[PDB]
Structure formats: C-alpha cells, structure tokens
Amino acid sequence: EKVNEILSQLTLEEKVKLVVGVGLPGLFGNPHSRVAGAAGETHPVPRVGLPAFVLADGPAGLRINPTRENDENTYYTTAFPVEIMLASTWNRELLEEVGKAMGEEVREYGVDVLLAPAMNIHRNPLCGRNFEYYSEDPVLSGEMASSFVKGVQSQGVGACIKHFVANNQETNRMVVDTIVSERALREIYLRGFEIAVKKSKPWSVMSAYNKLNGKYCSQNEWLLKKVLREEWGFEGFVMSDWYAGDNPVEQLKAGNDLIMPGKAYQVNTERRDEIEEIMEALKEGKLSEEVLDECVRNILKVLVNAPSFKNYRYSNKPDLEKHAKVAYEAGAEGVVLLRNEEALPLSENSKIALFGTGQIETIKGGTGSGDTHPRYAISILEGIKERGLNFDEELAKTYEDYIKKMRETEEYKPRRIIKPKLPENFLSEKEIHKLAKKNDVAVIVISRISGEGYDRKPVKGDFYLSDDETDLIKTVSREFHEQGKKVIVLLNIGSPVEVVSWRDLVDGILLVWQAGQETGRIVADVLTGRINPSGKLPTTFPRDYSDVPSWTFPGEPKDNPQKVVYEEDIYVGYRYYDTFGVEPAYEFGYGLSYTTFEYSDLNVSFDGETLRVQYRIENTGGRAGKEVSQVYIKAPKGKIDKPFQELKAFHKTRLLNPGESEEVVLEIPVRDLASFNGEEWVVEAGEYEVRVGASSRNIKLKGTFSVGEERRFKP
Ligand SMILES: OC[C@H]1O[C@@H](O)[C@H](O)[C@@H](O)[C@@H]1O
Ligand SMILES: [Br-]
Ligand SMILES: [Br-]
Ligand SMILES: [Br-]
Ligand SMILES: [Br-]
C-alpha cells in the first residue's frame, strides 16, 4: 500500500529520475555521497517523502572513505578475508556471521545496499576477480552466498548478488559476447544465483557488464525477466553494473530497474544523459509508462524497507573490535593446508628464518571496487612478532632494509597504483647456508595480487613462479634439508598458481590466501598450531595451465576479444577433471588437518522426494579440529551425458576434541538431482551413487539409492 501510494503520487519525470543513479559520487563534476566514497546514490524526491538511498561496495568489507574534509571523525571499516578464502571455510554458519558483521557496519555508516556478494563461477584460474568469487562449483557458491546474504539482511540493510551472469573474465568485460549453451547456463552459471535468489531473497541483483549470447545482461529480457522473475520468483530489483550496457530504454524493458551509476556521458562521450533519453522515449512511445511503473515499483517495494526511508539515525560507530574477531575466525577457518610432511605445526620456540618480501608486503586482498581501507593490516612478519615467536631478528631487519631500498629505486617504486614485483633471490648461496645453521626451520612467503579490470597471464611471476622465486626455494630447501631441517611455504595468493614443479622440494605448504586486516595474526596462530587448519579448496589447482578445460579464455581475437565461447560447457572445474581423467595438482575440496578423522555409519534413504544422507565423523587424532565433508552424487548414464559426479551437499563439523564424534544429517530435495536436457530439468530413473568425501577424490563412504520414477520440471 505504501508503494502504491507513493507511486500514484509520482509525476512522470520523478519516476524517470528514480530509475537512474545520480552519477558517480565525488568524481567528475559530481558531489560526494552523504557517505563519502559510496559507489552510488538514487535520486531523492522530497515531494512525496523519498530520500536518496546509498549503495556501496563491497565483497571484502564496506568500502567508503576513511576520512572526510572538515571532519575530525574516523570512518574505518573491517577488511575481511577475500571470498575465495571465505569459500575455503565451507562453513555456512560462519559466512552468516561475516554477513552480520559487515551488515552492522553498512547500517551504522548510513548505507542502504551493500554491493555484495560477488558469486560468478571460477571458470578459469586466470580471471582477475577470482579472489572475490567463491568457487568453480554452483552449489558451494550458491550456499555460501545465501548464508552471507542472510547475515547482511538480518541487519535491516540489503545485499546485492553479482554479477548476473557469466562474468567470468575481465578482458573486455564491457564488450565481450559470451557464448554459452542453455544447459551450461542452467547447471553451472545461473545455478548459484538461482540457489541464492530462492534461499536468501537478496534485495537486489546486479546485471553483468558482458553480453550473453548476443545481448547485454543489463538488456537481456530472457535473463532478467523470464528466468529471474517468471521462473525463479525474484521479488527484489535489478541494478546495472556501473556504466554497463548501451541503451537505457532497452535496460528498463528488459527488467533492469535501476541504471547505475548514472550520467554515463561523463565516462563515454557517445552516451546521452539517460534521463533525457528515457524522457524522449516516453514522449515518442518507444517506452510505455506501465513498464516504467513496474521498474519504479520493483525498486520502491524493496527500498521502503531501507533505513534511509525511515530516517534512521546511524551512529557512525560500528563495533569494529567485535568485527575484527569475526574477521579472524573467518580467516582461521579458510586457510588451506596443502602439504605437511611432519612439518607443522612448528615446535614451540623454534627459530624461524622468514623468507620472501611478502612477509612484509603481505597481500590482504585484491584491488578494485572490492578493495578496503582498514585502520591497520597485520603483515606476516608483524603477526609473528606480535605472538612473540622466535624468528631471525637479523634476517627480518635485512628484509626490511632491502624492501625500503628497492621501493626507493626508479624501477621498483610504485607508479600508476601498481608495485613492480620485487626480486626475491637477493641472498647469496653462502648467506642462506648461514641461516640454515642458525635457525631451526625455514618459512617462505610467496605473494600474488590481482584485481578488477585485469586478467592474469599464464607466465612466470603470475600463474608460474618467477625464476628468482624458484631459485630461492631450491636453495633454501637444499640448505635446510642439508641440516636436516624442514622448509615451509606460505601461499599468500588470490587464485591458483603452479605448484607441481616445486612442491616436492618443501615439507609444508599453507595456502594463506589473502586474509584481510588480521592476516598476520591468523598465519602466526596457524603456524604454532593454535589454529588447526580446517579449510578446503573451493577451486581446482591444475598441474599446468594447459590442463585447464576453459581453453578459449579470454576469447577471440585474443588481443582484443569480441567473443568467447564456453566450449567446455558444463565440464568446468572438477566436472572436467573427473569426467575425462585429467589429474589436478590439488583437487576441488582438498585440504589437510593437524589431526585425523574417521568416517563411518553411512545411511542412505530416498522417499521419492528427499534424499537423506547420514554418517558419523570422529576425531581420531591428538588435536582438536573441524572436518569438512562433501557429498557427491554420481547419476546414472541413462539418456544424456553428465559429469562423473556433482557436489550436492556439504557439512562442517563443530570443533571436535580428540575422541569426539558428530552425526551428520544432510537432506537433498529430488529436484536438485536433475540435469537440464536443453528444454527441461530431468531426474532420470535408475541407480545413483552417494559418495561422501574428504575431497572430490578422497571418497570415504559409498552407498546407492534408486529413483523409480522419472521426474520432469519445466523452467
Ligand atoms: O563500484 C561499483 C561497481 O563497479 C564495477 O566496476 C564492478 O564491476 C562492481 O562489482 C562494483 O560494485
Ligand atoms: Br557466473
Ligand atoms: Br603435496
Ligand atoms: Br592472485
Ligand atoms: Br572463443
């Protein structure tokens, strides 16, 4: 009634104003948002009591300006582990807590909609934004997104899942035509969004930059209307990615309700002011007022529940200390232990020789709209210092002096904002021999960063180790093994890198990802064993880049892609490696622990409507720890080709003490068993295999059930 009331009072022009952003705030000619640094604002209409609503990034935490002009107050935010690390936790409960924490900050800093989470599929490891997406798998991705959204929206503010859909590379994202079969769309790319939309009901969806099978996502009626609304029952509103598309009236007709950030002419000379174009379209009858009304109603039905609509007095003082704890917990459960040949955790008071410039230039997250401005960011060295761990104080100072010396030089000083990659092999072969005799263990930091706007390359220094990095590892490993001592590598990265070439040279490998402000503290605590690694890969680590099935990336022509075809189709990530027998370096769902777990007591039952899978996990080791279990279903070959297996459920146990067990009970609706044959979702009759694994390739328990009657579901 409120909506219909306001809507009936709005003039034609006011309605048009409402469906377009007010321009990128604080840039070009534009005024700062009332929340300085916010990504966008809507047009206010005081006439009928409508305020401007505020939208802000992002996935790693709220991104706003830490300071303001003529202002003595602080506006620092919490910088959380990046999404790929959050996904590595495989912990829904925890994702919800992260959402609540962020949501509280969103609310109290005067923001109405958080531009998160990002949930595009990891099609290819080279995508520059992989760090801020969850997984190569739609179920993990959708489930983690759902938990996050619920946490955010329990705080009276809105989330926004992005980017819908198939935004799986950065190269020419604003222009590239993405060619994908409807099957790959429904099973892989749409699927995570479908799960999120139905389970967590986000206030909003952001349409992607790219074209999908010939049409901009922001101008795609099939995507935004037929699928999103008519099929899925989406009740929120759709906004465009910033400056996406080329036609404002086509956007509204397609079901893209809110055009952001507005004033596209400020960035692209060939674009008209969208308000003027829309007004003209209405005058000439290219656009009906009824279409406009529906778009306005979609926005208002959501935003009348926003804090700004009720003049909420935000405090500007969220409980950061409480949020820092949540950030720590998230990073703690998201570290992945990839290798441990009796190397971790480190013995108490062990003398550590810390290597790698990344020990100091620790990467807390990726760059772009998903960046953050925390009050502090604890480097790996600082974290070890803080915990009072025994390290080579001499060596640390040497590193500190070397970095400062390098960042001063013309070649390695920061330009425009990039930091040239520093040489890592600046130690003499004899110098390191010294370290091997003096210290007990070696710990090597390998760092990578990436970000919005750029894809990674399959070359040394990016996907592959640089020669200097390889030489460092080779020398450190030889010298320390010489002394009978262990060497550990910490992977401070945002997406997979080559590991096969060097992994057999070291004893321990900790995938530390990029863990936000608390990184150093998490890393130190993992090293000592205060934290028992419970993370598992949400993405496949290929032996070599050439093994990756999404070979068409980044499209054609390579240097300036106008199109990219998803030739691998549904066979992306582990679906490919399992189905066609290609062995990964480390598989989807892989992760080690400082303790051991035994799986037992499998019971599988199916009542025609629900698949029920039960089993027990016991801690059979000597240290407390959590275990992530994964339920894969292998469908019968039947009528249509299908992947070897597909993740359908997953679970993470409580913190189990030695000897403790927990009974796991997971239910899977029959519909989730379907494959899409191009027309309909079909659950084929026949025998299905239930595979309960500690990873996609470490199946602990197997059972079968049967579907007696074929089930069909029309979209
Ligand atoms: O900053 C607003 C938006 O900018 C765009 O370039 C990104 O693709 C979005 O993820 C972001 O929310
Ligand atoms: Br996607
Ligand atoms: Br290994
Ligand atoms: Br990276
Ligand atoms: Br192609």
Side-chain angles (χ1 to χ4, degrees), residues 315-352:
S315 63
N316 286 143
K317 269 147 179 49
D319 191 357
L320 291 171
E321 252 84 11
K322 177 170 171 288
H323 295 159
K325 260 184 173 298
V326 176
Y328 171 100
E329 286 302 321
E333 293 201 19
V335 168
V336 184
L337 184 63
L338 297 167
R339 184 176 169 96
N340 189 23
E341 301 300 315
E342 309 170 5
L344 297 161
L346 298 175
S347 297
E348 202 178 40
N349 288 340
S350 184
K351 311 149 220 155
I352 305 161

Side-chain angles (χ1 to χ4, degrees), residues 261-465:
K263 289 184 173 60
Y265 56 81
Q266 296 180 328
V267 156
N268 177 340
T269 165
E270 282 112 56
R271 294 293 312 271
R272 302 170 58 182
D273 171 78
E274 34 277 288
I275 287 171
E276 288 170 12
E277 181 165 358
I278 295 170
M279 287 297 287
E280 177 191 86
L282 288 163
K283 180 186 185 65
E284 297 182 1
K286 295 182 174 184
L287 180 73
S288 69
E289 188 170 357
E290 24 280 7
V291 168
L292 186 64
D293 287 350
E294 183 177 58
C295 290
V296 178
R297 179 156 46 246
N298 285 342
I299 297 168
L300 299 184
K301 64 182 177 181
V302 169
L303 295 183
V304 293
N305 304 295
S308 288
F309 181 77
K310 283 182 171 180
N311 305 333
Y312 178 72
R313 172 190 290 197
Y314 47 89
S315 63
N316 286 143
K317 269 147 179 49
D319 191 357
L320 291 171
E321 252 84 11
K322 177 170 171 288
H323 295 159
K325 260 184 173 298
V326 176
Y328 171 100
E329 286 302 321
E333 293 201 19
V335 168
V336 184
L337 184 63
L338 297 167
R339 184 176 169 96
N340 189 23
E341 301 300 315
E342 309 170 5
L344 297 161
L346 298 175
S347 297
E348 202 178 40
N349 288 340
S350 184
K351 311 149 220 155
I352 305 161
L354 196 56
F355 294 96
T357 63
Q359 67 180 264
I360 282 166
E361 303 196 317
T362 302
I363 310 300
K364 70 161 177 55
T367 63
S369 67
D371 206 345
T372 49
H373 316 118
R375 186 175 63 87
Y376 61 82
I378 310 294
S379 72
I380 288 172
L381 175 56
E382 289 169 322
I384 293 175
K385 286 187 189 171
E386 196 171 352
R387 297 290 111 118
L389 300 189
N390 289 336
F391 68 97
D392 191 329
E393 332 77 7
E394 216 289 339
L395 180 55
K397 291 185 180 180
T398 294
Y399 262 91
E400 289 169 333
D401 292 337
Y402 168 79
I403 295 169
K404 293 183 182 299
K405 168 175 53 187
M406 300 301 284
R407 290 306 176 192
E408 190 287 327
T409 192
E410 279 298 316
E411 188 179 10
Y412 300 103
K413 76 172 188 176
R415 313 93 178 278
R416 297 253 63 181
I417 171 185
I418 54 84
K419 300 191 185 184
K421 186 173 179 52
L422 300 179
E424 296 284 0
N425 64 341
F426 68 106
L427 262 46
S428 165
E429 199 166 70
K430 295 184 177 180
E431 286 185 310
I432 293 182
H433 178 85
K434 303 301 182 187
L435 283 317
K437 282 169 47 58
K438 168 181 178 176
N439 299 280
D440 299 331
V441 291
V443 171
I444 311 181
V445 181
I446 301 293
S447 290
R448 286 293 182 277
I449 195 177
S450 69
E452 186 186 341
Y454 320 82
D455 285 326
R456 299 196 296 146
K457 304 296 180 62
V459 305
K460 290 164 171 183
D462 207 343
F463 178 83
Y464 295 98
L465 262 49

Side-chain angles (χ1 to χ4, degrees), residues 120-121 165-168 189 193:
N120 292 101
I121 292 296
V165 71
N167 179 205
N168 309 106
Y189 302 99
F193 296 92

Side-chain angles (χ1 to χ4, degrees), residues 596-635:
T596 62
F597 303 97
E598 187 71 16
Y599 286 57
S600 73
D601 299 343
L602 177 70
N603 186 249
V604 175
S605 56
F606 179 67
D607 61 8
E609 211 66 34
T610 304
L611 173 63
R612 188 184 181 273
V613 306
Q614 173 224 311
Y615 47 95
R616 184 170 60 97
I617 297 181
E618 181 187 344
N619 185 344
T620 55
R623 309 179 68 98
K626 294 185 172 195
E627 171 67 344
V628 173
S629 60
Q630 301 142 37
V631 185
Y632 300 90
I633 306 294
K634 177 158 182 59

Side-chain angles (χ1 to χ4, degrees), residues 2-10 48 50 300 304 309:
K2 264 71 181 189
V3 181
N4 303 284
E5 194 70 37
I6 301 170
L7 194 30
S8 83
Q9 296 166 356
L10 292 164
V48 305
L50 284 168
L300 299 184
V304 293
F309 181 77

Side-chain angles (χ1 to χ4, degrees), residues 15-211:
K15 295 172 180 181
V16 180
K17 282 187 177 62
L18 276 178
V19 306
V20 180
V22 298
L24 196 52
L27 285 182
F28 318 114
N30 307 334
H32 278 284
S33 166
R34 63 162 177 259
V35 181
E41 276 191 11
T42 65
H43 280 92
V45 187
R47 248 202 79 247
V48 305
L50 284 168
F53 300 91
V54 179
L55 312 198
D57 293 300
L62 176 60
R63 187 178 57 80
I64 61 170
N65 296 347
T67 66
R68 297 174 189 175
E69 304 153 42
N70 303 168
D71 201 341
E72 74 283 2
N73 288 303
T74 253
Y75 305 92
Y76 288 112
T77 199
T78 308
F80 290 84
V82 299
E83 287 198 13
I84 195 173
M85 182 172 214
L86 295 183
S88 297
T89 78
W90 292 71
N91 186 340
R92 296 184 188 88
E93 177 176 17
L94 187 45
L95 259 284
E96 188 161 350
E97 287 296 304
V98 171
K100 296 185 197 176
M102 286 188 54
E104 183 203 328
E105 299 187 358
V106 165
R107 182 186 64 243
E108 295 306 331
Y109 277 133
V111 178
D112 297 297
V113 183
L114 176 71
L115 303 181
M119 57 184 306
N120 292 101
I121 292 296
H122 293 153
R123 167 178 187 248
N124 185 291
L126 298 185
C127 180
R129 300 184 77 170
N130 283 341
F131 75 91
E132 60 180 341
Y133 303 147
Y134 295 117
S135 185
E136 66 192 22
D137 177 85
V139 162
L140 180 52
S141 183
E143 285 293 323
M144 299 293 270
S146 295
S147 288
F148 179 78
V149 169
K150 289 180 180 178
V152 174
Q153 303 188 155
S154 70
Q155 297 299 298
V157 288
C160 179
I161 63 175
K162 60 184 190 182
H163 314 80
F164 200 55
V165 71
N167 179 205
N168 309 106
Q169 64 179 57
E170 290 302 280
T171 306
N172 283 1
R173 53 177 179 162
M174 299 187 65
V175 122
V176 72
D177 196 359
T178 313
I179 309 295
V180 209
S181 66
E182 185 169 354
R183 180 180 190 184
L185 286 174
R186 296 203 184 263
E187 301 197 11
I188 302 293
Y189 302 99
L190 292 169
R191 184 75 183 107
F193 296 92
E194 178 186 15
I195 297 176
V197 164
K198 295 188 182 175
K199 296 200 180 190
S200 68
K201 300 188 182 69
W203 286 19
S204 65
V205 172
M206 181 187 307
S207 51
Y209 275 121
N210 53 275
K211 297 184 175 185

